[PDB]
Design a protein around this ligand. Structure first.
Ligand SMILES: Nc1nc2c(ncn2[C@@H]2O[C@H](COP(=O)(O)OP(=O)(O)NP(=O)(O)O)[C@@H](O)[C@H]2O)c(=O)[nH]1
Ligand SMILES: Nc1nc2c(ncn2[C@@H]2O[C@H](COP(=O)(O)OP(=O)(O)NP(=O)(O)O)[C@@H](O)[C@H]2O)c(=O)[nH]1
Ligand SMILES: [Mg+2]
Ligand SMILES: [Mg+2]
Lengths: 204, 164
């Protein structure tokens, strides 16, 4: 069984953590903002998926870059019901895709909060994120991460995961050795300039 | 009952936080010696906290209070420049500790009310938090002096505790 690594990105309040709970069937959990790291393992088909749940607030989202070398793909979540933020999300997503370690990796976009009256169609999200000129394979799934109490989770959550897995899968041959390598590189520089920082208060 | 460990460099603001969460007066606070028990009732749990000093001579005695720890709260002076690296080394030593395995980490980035106070994301980098893979962690910017951030930090912590 292959292991792949996925990052949950997208602005704060988009619904990353909630979607992560729902897709596991953990329905009655409520959520607080995320300001750090949180690993979670899922299974889809013949793949075992480790999911980094990260914060997207202004004061923590600059941390994303620290993880990108270790990932095969991104789940990018957008509050489709908050078009006032599409532009911010667009910049933010563009900046991720322009990262060296993001080449050739697919993005699964969730147009979340389709329950809300202001939910923009999956179509307007496309234009809003400038996906036509994007340089990565992508797909968009409208969804409702927070279904009402006593109702099944949105099946479009696993549909999107399935597509992302399928896409990583079709390219697993060149992508995975690339990720194992590049994650090792980043890991060892972060260690070495820690070693410098560490025994540079040997100072006594 | 949850066994909650609260550590950090001396002057980081451990006691001031603990007292603020306890609805007590913080106007005159003293550096801490010995091992003072604090009992917080929160979400139908009873939190057993040792309030401990973070002076260099006290730190080796930290090791004696690690057992069946349900959560680790770590306090940083966000506005104290030169001591940032010293704080990192001590937290690193803690996360290497065996009885800390899989223990949720809450970092209180304290004294956000001070000019020069680092933001969550730079603290996360200077403390090498972004290298962690084996535990869940929050960095919660806060000001014990002004009573901001504390309830939010504990809210996350209590979620991780009640999950287990
Ligand atoms: N109506 C509606 N509300 C939703 C939906 N999904 C999430 N929410 C709400 O949106 C808010 C943010 O959820 P959350 O999962 O914490 O977002 P996040 O992206 O993880 N934020 P952060 O990046 O700060 O951790 C919560 O109040 C949550 O209940 C949805 O599909 N519909
Ligand atoms: N500006 C500011 N000062 C704070 C804040 N919290 C605590 N302090 C101050 O920082 C100093 C040290 O606080 P203290 O609570 O003793 O820290 P400590 O970690 O308990 N020290 P020790 O390890 O020696 O017991 C005191 O002057 C305290 O009032 C805060 O949020 N803002
Ligand atoms: Mg979240
Ligand atoms: Mg003290």
């Amino acid at each position: 069984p292959r292991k792949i690594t996925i990052a949950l990105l997208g602005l704060d309040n988009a619904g990353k953590t909630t979607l992560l709970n729902s897709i596991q069937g953990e329905v009655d959990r409520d959520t607080t903002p995320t300001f750090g790291f949180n690993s979670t393992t899922l299974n889809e088909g013949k793949y075992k998926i480790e999911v980094f749940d990260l914060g997207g607030g202004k004061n923590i989202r600059g941390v994303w870059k620290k993880y990108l070398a270790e990932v095969h793909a991104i789940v990018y979540v957008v509050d489709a019901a908050d078009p006032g933020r599409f532009e911010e999300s667009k910049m933010t997503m563009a900046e991720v895709l322009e990262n060296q370690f993001m080449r050739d990796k697919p993005i699964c976009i969730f147009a979340n909060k389709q329950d809300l009256p202001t939910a923009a169609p999956a179509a307007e999200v496309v234009k809003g994120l400038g996906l036509a000129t994007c340089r990565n394979s992508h797909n968009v799934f409208p969804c409702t991460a927070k279904m009402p109490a006593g109702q099944d989770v949105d099946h479009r959550l696993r549909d999107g995961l399935k597509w992302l897995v399928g896409t990583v899968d079709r390219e697993f041959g060149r992508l995975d050795p690339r990720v194992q390598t590049e994650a090792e590189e980043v890991r060892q520089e972060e260690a070495r300039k820690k070693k410098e920082r560490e025994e540079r208060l040997r100072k006594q | 009952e949850a066994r909650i460990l609260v550590l950090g460099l001396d002057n980081a603001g451990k006691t001031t936080i603990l007292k603020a969460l306890s609805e007590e007066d913080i106007t005159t606070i003293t550096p801490t010696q010995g091992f003072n028990i604090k009992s917080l009732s929160r979400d139908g749990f009873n939190l057993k906290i040792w309030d401990i000093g973070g002076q260099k001579s006290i730190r080796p005695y930290w090791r004696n209070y690690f057992d069946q720890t349900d959560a680790l709260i770590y306090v940083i002076d966000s506005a104290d420049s030169k001591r940032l690296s010293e704080s990192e080394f001590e937290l690193t030593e803690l996360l290497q500790e065996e009885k800390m395995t899989g223990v949720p980490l809450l970092v209180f980035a304290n004294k956000q009310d001070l000019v020069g106070a680092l933001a969550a994301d730079e603290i996360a980098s200077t403390l090498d938090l972004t290298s962690i893979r084996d535990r869940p962690w929050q960095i919660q910017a806060c000001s014990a002096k002004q009573g901001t951030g504390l309830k939010e930090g504990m809210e996350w912590m209590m979620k991780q505790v009640k999950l287990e």
